[PDB]
From Swiss-Prot, chains A, B:
It comes from the Bacteria. Its main location: periplasm. PANTHER family: AURACYANIN-B (PTHR38439), OUTER MEMBRANE PROTEIN H.8 (PTHR38439:SF2). The keyword Disulfide bond applies. It comes from Achromobacter denitrificans (Alcaligenes denitrificans). This is Azurin. The keyword Zinc-finger does not apply. Residues 1-129 form the Plastocyanin-like domain.
Amino acid sequence: AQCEATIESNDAMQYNLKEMVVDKSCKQFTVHLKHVGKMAKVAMGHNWVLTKEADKQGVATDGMNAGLAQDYVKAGDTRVIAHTKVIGGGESDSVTFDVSKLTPGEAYAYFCSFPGHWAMMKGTLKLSN
Amino acid sequence: AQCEATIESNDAMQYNLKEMVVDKSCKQFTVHLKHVGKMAKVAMGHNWVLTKEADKQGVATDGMNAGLAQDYVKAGDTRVIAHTKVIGGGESDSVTFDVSKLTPGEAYAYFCSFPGHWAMMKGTLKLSN
Ligand SMILES: [Cu+2]
Ligand SMILES: [Cu+2]
């Protein structure tokens, strides 16, 4: 139907969705990230970052060096298709991006770039089929 | 009794012990850290760091800034009583420290300083008979 999806993140360092599908009828798509835990962002902040599967480790490594104030994502990172800000417990953030940045058939990776979270908080995104 | 203890770390970002007791008869205490998971040290490495409870956040912070080659511990950090190296799945490391560094009745914090791990990997250590 909709060109929107909600994904939850918690205090156990997990996302509640392992895969996300963007419908081909969509021109744009919005991701609503919710932090349903009760930990503060300095200890367990979460974001949602979308890249091609192969840019994962690099984006993460460099986001890590950008710091909390930069949402742990290097500014102007060309590898990042879209990202939310870092949020803490009881908060939410939304990000909308152009579906045309995506390529039918390709698997993209989405993950949390907060220090050390990428290993556990990761999933796959792609176009409908 | 004896002056040693074994603690396990896993791919779920947890330690298996929340408290450790050093017996008062000990002059030397040895901690054996085991990584029972299978993830690489760059993605889910673990260490064991001992500080006064107070110093947890600061040591964690500076440690993260020290980098993997420094085992995520600021070199010569004086707030650090003892620490292991950063290890990956299938490995183990041990550290032996002088009990005289601890003062009876005080609480000590032990935690993992690998980026972002300190929030879920923490325990208390105390001297007792
Ligand atoms: Cu996170
Ligand atoms: Cu760790």
